[PDB]
Tab-separated table of C-alpha atoms in Angstrom:
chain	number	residue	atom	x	y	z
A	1	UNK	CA	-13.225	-34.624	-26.507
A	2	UNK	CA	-13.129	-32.714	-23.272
A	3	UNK	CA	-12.985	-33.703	-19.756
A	4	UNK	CA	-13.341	-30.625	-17.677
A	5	UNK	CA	-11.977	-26.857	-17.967
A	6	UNK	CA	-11.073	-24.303	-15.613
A	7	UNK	CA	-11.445	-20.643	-15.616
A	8	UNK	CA	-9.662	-18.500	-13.739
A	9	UNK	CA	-10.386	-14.403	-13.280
A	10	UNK	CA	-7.161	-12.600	-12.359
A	11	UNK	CA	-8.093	-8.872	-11.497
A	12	UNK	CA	-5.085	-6.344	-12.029
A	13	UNK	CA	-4.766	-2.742	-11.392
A	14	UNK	CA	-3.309	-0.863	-13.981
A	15	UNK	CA	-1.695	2.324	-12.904
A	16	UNK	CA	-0.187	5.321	-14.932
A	17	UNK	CA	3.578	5.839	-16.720
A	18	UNK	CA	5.250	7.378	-19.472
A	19	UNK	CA	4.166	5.662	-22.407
A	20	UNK	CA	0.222	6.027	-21.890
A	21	UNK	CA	-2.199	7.867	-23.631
A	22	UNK	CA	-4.497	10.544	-22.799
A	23	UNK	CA	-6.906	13.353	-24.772
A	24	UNK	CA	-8.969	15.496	-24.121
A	25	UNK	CA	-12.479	16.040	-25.940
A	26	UNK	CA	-11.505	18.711	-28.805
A	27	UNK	CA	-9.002	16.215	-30.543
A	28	UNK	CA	-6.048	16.560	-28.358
A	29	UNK	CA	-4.223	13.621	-28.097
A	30	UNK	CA	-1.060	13.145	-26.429
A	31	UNK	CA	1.374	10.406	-24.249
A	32	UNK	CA	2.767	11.165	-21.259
A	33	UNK	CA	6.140	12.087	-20.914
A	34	UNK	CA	7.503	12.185	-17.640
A	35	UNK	CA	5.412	12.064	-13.610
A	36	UNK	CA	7.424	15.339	-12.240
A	37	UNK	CA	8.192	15.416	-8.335
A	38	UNK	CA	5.082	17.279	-6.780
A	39	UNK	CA	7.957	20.521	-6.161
A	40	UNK	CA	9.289	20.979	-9.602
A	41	UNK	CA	5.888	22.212	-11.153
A	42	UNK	CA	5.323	25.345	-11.664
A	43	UNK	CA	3.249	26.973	-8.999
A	44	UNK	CA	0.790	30.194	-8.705
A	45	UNK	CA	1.052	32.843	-5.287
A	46	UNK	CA	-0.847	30.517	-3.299
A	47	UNK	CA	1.830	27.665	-3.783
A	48	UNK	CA	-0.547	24.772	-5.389
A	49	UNK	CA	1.169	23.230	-8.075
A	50	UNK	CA	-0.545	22.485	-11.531
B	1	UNK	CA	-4.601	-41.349	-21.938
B	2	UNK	CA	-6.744	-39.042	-20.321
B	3	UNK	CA	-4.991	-35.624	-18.999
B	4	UNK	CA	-5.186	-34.819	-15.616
B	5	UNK	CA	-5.644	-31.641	-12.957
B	6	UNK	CA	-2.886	-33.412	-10.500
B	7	UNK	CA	-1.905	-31.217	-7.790
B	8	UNK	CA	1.374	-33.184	-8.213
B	9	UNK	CA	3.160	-31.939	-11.112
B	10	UNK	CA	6.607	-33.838	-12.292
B	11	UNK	CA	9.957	-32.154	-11.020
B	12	UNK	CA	8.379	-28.004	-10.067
B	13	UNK	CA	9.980	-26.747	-7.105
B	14	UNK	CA	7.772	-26.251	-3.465
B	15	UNK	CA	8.120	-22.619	-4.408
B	16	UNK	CA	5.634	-23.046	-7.157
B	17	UNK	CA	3.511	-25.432	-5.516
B	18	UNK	CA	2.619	-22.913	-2.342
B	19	UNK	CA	-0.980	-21.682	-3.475
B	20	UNK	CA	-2.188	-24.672	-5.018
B	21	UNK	CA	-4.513	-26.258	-2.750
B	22	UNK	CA	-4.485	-30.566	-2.441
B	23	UNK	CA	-7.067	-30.175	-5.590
B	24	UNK	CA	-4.602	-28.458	-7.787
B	25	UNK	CA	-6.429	-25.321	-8.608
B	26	UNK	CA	-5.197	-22.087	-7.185
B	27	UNK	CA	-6.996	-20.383	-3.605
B	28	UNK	CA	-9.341	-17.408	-4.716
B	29	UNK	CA	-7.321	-14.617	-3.326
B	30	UNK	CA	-3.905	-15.460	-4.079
B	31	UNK	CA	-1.788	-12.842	-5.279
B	32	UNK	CA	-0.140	-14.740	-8.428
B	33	UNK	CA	2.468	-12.520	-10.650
B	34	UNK	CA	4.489	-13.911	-13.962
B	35	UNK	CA	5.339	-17.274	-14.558
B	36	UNK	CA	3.284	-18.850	-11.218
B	37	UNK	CA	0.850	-21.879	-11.563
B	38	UNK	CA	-2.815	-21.428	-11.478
B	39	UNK	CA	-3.682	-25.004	-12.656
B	40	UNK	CA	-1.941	-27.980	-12.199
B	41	UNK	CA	-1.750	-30.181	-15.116
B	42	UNK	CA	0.290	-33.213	-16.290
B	43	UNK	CA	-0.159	-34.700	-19.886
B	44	UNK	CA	0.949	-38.368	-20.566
B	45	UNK	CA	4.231	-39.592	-22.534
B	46	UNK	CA	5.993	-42.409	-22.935
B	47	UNK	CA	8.730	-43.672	-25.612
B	48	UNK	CA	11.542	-41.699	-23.973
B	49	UNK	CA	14.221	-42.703	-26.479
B	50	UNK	CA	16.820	-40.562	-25.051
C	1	UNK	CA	29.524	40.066	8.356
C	2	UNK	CA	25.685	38.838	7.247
C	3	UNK	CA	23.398	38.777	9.763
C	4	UNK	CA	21.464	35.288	11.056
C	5	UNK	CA	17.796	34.640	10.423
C	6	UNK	CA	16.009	33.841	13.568
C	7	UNK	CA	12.535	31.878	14.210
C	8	UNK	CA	10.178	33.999	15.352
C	9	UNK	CA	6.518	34.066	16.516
C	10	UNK	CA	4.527	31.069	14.566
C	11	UNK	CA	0.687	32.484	13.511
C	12	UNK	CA	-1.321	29.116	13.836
C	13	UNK	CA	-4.559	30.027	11.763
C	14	UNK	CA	-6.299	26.458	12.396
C	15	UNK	CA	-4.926	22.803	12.881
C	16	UNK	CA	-3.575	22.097	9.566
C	17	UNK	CA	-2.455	26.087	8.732
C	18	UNK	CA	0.370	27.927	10.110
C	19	UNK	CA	2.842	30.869	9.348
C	20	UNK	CA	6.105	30.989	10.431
C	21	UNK	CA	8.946	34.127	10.037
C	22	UNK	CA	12.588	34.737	10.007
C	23	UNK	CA	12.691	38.196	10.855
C	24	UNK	CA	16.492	39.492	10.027
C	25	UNK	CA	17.051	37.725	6.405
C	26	UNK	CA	19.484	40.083	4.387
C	27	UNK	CA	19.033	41.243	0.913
C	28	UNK	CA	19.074	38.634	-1.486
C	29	UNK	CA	18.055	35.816	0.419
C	30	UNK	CA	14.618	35.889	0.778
C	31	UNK	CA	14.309	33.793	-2.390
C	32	UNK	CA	17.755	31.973	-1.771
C	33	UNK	CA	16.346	30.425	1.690
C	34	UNK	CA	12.410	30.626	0.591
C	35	UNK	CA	12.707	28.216	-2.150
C	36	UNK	CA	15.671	26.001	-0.565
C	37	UNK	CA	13.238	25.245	2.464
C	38	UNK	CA	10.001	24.425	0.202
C	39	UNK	CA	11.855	22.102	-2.125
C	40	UNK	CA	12.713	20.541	1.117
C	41	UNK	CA	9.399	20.273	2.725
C	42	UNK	CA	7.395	19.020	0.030
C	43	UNK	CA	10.240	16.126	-0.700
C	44	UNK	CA	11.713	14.560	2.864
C	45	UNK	CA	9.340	14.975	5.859
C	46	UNK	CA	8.919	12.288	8.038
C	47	UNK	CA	5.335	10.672	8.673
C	48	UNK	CA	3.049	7.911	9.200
C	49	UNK	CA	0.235	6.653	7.128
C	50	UNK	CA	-1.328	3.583	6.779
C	51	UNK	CA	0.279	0.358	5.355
C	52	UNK	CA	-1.982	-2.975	5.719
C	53	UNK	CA	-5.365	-3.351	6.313
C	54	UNK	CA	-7.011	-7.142	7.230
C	55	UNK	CA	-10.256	-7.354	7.993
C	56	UNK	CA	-11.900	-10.424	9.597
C	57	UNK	CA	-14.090	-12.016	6.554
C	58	UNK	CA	-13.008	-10.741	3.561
C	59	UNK	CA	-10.559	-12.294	1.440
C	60	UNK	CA	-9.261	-9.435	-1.483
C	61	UNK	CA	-9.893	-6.200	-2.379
C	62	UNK	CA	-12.635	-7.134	-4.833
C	63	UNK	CA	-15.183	-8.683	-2.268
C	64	UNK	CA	-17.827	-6.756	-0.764
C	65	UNK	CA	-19.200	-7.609	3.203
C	66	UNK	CA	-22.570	-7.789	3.793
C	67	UNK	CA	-24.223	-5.183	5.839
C	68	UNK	CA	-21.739	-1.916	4.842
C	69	UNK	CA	-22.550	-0.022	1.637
C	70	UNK	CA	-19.112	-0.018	0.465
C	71	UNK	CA	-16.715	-2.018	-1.486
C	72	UNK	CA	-13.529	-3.691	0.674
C	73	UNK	CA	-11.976	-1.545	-2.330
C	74	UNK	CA	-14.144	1.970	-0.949
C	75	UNK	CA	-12.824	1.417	2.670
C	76	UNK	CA	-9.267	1.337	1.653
C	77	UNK	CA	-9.241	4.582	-0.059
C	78	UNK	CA	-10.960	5.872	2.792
C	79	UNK	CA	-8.505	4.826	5.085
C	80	UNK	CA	-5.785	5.782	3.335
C	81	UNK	CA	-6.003	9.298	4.195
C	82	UNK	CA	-6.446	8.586	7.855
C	83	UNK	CA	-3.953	11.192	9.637
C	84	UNK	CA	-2.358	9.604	12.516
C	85	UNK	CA	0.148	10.265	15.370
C	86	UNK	CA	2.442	7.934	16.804
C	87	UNK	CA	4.469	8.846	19.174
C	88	UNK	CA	7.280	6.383	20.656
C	89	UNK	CA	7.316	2.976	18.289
C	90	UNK	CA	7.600	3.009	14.606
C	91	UNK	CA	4.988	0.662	14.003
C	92	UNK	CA	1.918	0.040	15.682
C	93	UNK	CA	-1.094	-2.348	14.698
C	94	UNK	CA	-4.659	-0.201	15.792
C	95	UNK	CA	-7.743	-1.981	16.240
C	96	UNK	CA	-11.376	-1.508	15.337
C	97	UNK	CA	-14.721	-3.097	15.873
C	98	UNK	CA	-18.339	-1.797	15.643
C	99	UNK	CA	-22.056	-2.899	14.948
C	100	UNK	CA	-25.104	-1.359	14.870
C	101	UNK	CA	-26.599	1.210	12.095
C	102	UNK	CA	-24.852	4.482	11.748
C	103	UNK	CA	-21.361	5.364	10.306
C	104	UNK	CA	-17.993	4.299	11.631
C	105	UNK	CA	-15.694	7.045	11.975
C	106	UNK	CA	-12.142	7.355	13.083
C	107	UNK	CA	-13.575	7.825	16.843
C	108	UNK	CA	-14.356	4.440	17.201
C	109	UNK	CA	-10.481	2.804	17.278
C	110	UNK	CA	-9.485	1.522	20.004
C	111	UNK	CA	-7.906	4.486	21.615
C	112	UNK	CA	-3.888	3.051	22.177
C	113	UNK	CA	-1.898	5.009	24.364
C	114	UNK	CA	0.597	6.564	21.967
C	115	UNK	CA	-1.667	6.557	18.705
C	116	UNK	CA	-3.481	10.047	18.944
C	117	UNK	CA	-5.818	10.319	15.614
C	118	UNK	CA	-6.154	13.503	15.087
C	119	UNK	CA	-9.161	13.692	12.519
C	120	UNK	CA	-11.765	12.085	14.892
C	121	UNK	CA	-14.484	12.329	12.903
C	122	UNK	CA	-12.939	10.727	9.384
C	123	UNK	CA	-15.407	9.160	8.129
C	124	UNK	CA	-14.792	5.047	7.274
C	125	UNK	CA	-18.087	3.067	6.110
C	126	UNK	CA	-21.478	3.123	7.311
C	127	UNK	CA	-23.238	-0.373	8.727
C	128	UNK	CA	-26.464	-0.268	7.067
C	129	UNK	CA	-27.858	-2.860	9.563
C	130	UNK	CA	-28.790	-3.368	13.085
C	131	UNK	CA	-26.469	-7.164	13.355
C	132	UNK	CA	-23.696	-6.092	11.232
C	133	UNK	CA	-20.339	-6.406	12.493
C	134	UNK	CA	-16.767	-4.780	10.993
C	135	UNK	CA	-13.557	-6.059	12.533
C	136	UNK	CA	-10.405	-4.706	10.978
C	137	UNK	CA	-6.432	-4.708	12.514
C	138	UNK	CA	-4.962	-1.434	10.431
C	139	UNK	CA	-0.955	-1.149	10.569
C	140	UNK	CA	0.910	2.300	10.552
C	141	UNK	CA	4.564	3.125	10.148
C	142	UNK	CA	7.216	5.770	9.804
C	143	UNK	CA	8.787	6.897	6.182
C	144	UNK	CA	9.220	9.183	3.591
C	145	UNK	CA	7.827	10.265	0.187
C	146	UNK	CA	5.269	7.781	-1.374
C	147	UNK	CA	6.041	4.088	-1.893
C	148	UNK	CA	2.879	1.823	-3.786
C	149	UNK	CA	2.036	-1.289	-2.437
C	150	UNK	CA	4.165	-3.221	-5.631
C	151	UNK	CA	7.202	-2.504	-4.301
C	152	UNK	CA	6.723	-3.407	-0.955
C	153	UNK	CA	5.637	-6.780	-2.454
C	154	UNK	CA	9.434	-7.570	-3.294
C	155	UNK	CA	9.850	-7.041	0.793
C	156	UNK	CA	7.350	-8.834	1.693
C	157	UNK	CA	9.337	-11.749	3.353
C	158	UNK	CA	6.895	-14.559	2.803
C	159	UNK	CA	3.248	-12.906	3.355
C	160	UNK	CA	2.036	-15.797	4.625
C	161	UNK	CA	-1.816	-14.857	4.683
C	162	UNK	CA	-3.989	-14.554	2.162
C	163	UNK	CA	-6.379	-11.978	3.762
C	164	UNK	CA	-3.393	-9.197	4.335
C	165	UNK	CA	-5.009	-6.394	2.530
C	166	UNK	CA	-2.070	-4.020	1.371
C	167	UNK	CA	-3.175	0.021	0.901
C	168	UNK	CA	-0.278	2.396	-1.131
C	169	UNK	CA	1.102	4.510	1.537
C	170	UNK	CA	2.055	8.367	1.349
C	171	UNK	CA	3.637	9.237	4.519
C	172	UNK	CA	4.001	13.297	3.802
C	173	UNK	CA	2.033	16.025	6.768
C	174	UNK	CA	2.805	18.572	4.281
C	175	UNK	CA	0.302	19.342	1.161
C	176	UNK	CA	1.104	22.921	-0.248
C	177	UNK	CA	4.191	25.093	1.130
C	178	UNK	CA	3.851	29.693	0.022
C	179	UNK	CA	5.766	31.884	0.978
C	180	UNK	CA	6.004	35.394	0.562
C	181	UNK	CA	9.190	37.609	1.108
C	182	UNK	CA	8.704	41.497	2.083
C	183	UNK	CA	10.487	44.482	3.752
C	184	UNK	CA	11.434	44.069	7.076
C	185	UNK	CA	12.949	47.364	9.139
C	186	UNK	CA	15.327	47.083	11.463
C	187	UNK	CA	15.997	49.810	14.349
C	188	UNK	CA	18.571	50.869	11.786
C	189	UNK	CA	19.122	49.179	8.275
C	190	UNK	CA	19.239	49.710	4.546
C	191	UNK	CA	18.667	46.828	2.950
C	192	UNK	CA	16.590	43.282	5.169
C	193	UNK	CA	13.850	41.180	4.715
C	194	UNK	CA	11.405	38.884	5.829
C	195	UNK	CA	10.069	35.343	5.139
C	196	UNK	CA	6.748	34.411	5.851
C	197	UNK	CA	6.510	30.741	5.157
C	198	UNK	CA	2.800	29.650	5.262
C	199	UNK	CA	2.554	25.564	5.077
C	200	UNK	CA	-0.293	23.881	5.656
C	201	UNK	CA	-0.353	20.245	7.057
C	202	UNK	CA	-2.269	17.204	8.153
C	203	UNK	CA	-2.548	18.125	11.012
C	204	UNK	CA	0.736	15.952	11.715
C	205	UNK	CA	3.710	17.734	11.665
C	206	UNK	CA	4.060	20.657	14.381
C	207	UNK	CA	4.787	23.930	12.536
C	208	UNK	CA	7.921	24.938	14.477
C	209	UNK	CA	9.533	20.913	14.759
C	210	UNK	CA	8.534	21.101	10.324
C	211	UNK	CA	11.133	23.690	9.673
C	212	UNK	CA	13.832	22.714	11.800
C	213	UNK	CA	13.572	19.473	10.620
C	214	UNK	CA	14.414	20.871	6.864
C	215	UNK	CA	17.508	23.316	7.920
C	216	UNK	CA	18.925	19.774	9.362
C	217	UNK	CA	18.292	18.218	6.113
C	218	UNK	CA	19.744	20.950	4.142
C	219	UNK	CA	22.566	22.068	5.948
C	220	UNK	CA	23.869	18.101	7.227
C	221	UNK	CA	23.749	18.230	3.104
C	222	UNK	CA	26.130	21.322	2.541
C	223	UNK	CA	29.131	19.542	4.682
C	224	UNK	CA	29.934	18.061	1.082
C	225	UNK	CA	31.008	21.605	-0.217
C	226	UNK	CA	32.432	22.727	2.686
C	227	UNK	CA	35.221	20.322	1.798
C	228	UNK	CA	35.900	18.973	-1.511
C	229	UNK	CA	37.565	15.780	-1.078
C	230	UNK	CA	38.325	15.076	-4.740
């Protein structure tokens, strides 16, 4: 009953947001919350943020 | 009748019709987003009966 | 009657370190000026990073040439942290073609008169043969902060070809910002400080044009408070 079909591969890049899930390996799950400005987290002597 | 893969389709805007080549499928590269055409298509119908 | 901070000498440890001071800070503001200025740095300095890549034979991201070892995916995160000077225009479009075995580097663009890379030996790809060929027409331009590549697709004004490559772009010269506020002496004073503000860059952004660049942006912001216009 067919004639001809068409497949088409559409390749998109997912980035990161709120909403997501991560976990690390000793069962701690979690979804992210916010993406902080690089200047408003905390920071040791040196100055590099966490 | 038999469907068809016209690169024509009935009443779509030139806006829509930009990355479909003469064939009617879509150029491998295109950057497509929601709602564009990938396929052309146009199914028969008569008996308007408006 | 406070007294004035004033630049003094600028410690350059390498090409991307540096130290700056502001010998006569009085007693409390160490931390009130220390903080103001990184908060500033980190956020709204100008620079230029890459923005659209097209090379001559491949199509999207996703392809692969023949003859590199890399992805066209691989060369665009290499290229994305490809530190660049320009010095007059706001946008220029660099150039680069090579062949032969051995790997390209960031020395091999054509050398434009105001473009000064400053990493020369960046690596890009390697050519893994002796008749392969790379051709590639990188763009650069001037901004702040970090805009992706989606939303410069809603000003893209009709991209008309289908091999324009687009790369995120992160034009920042600044990637960590200490500082460090300890006891200055005077010929004769109680209480003064001084900041030691040790940034580290690209090798971009001069040290001494970084810093007056932020008072500019901080205090062209206080004229707001200075009168309250209900």
């Amino acid at each position: 009953g067919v004639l001809k079909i068409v497949k088409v591969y559409l390749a998109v890049k997912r980035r990161i947001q709120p909403g997501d899930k991560m976990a690390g390996r000793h069962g701690n799950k979690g979804v992210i919350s916010k993406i902080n400005p690089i200047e408003d987290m905390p920071y040791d002597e040196n100055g590099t943020p966490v | 009748g038999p469907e068809e893969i016209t690169a024509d389709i009935p009443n779509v805007g030139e806006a829509a019709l930009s990355k479909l080549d003469e064939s009617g499928i879509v150029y491998i590269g295109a950057e497509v987003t929601g709602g564009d055409i990938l396929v052309g298509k146009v199914t028969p119908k008569g008996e308007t009966q408006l | 009657e406070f007294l004035k901070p004033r630049l003094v000498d600028i410690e350059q440890v390498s090409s991307t370190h540096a130290k700056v001071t502001l010998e006569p800070l009085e007693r409390g503001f160490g931390h009130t000026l220390g903080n103001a200025l990184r908060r500033i740095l980190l956020s709204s300095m100008p620079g230029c990073a890459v923005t659209e890549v097209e090379i001559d034979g491949v199509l999207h991201e996703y392809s692969t040439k023949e003859g590199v070892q890399e992805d066209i995916l691989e060369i665009l995160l290499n290229l994305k942290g490809l530190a660049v000077r320009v010095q007059g225009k706001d946008e220029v479009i660099l150039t680069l073609n090579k062949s032969g075995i051995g790997p390209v580097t960031a020395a091999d663009i054509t050398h434009d008169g105001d473009v000064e890379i400053v990493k020369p030996q960046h690596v890009i790809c390697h050519l893994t043969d002796e008749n392969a060929s790379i051709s590639m027409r990188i763009k650069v331009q001037r901004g702040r902060g970090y805009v992706p590549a989606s939303t410069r697709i809603h000003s893209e004004e009709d991209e008309r070809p289908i091999g324009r490559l687009l790369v995120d772009a992160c034009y920042s010269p600044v990637e960590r910002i200490a500082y460090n506020v300890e006891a200055a002496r005077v010929e004769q004073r109680t209480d003064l400080d001084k900041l030691v503000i040790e940034m580290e860059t690209n090798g971009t952004i001069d040290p001494e044009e970084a810093i007056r660049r932020a008072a500019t942006i901080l205090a062209e912001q206080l004229e707001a408070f200075v009168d309250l216009r209900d």
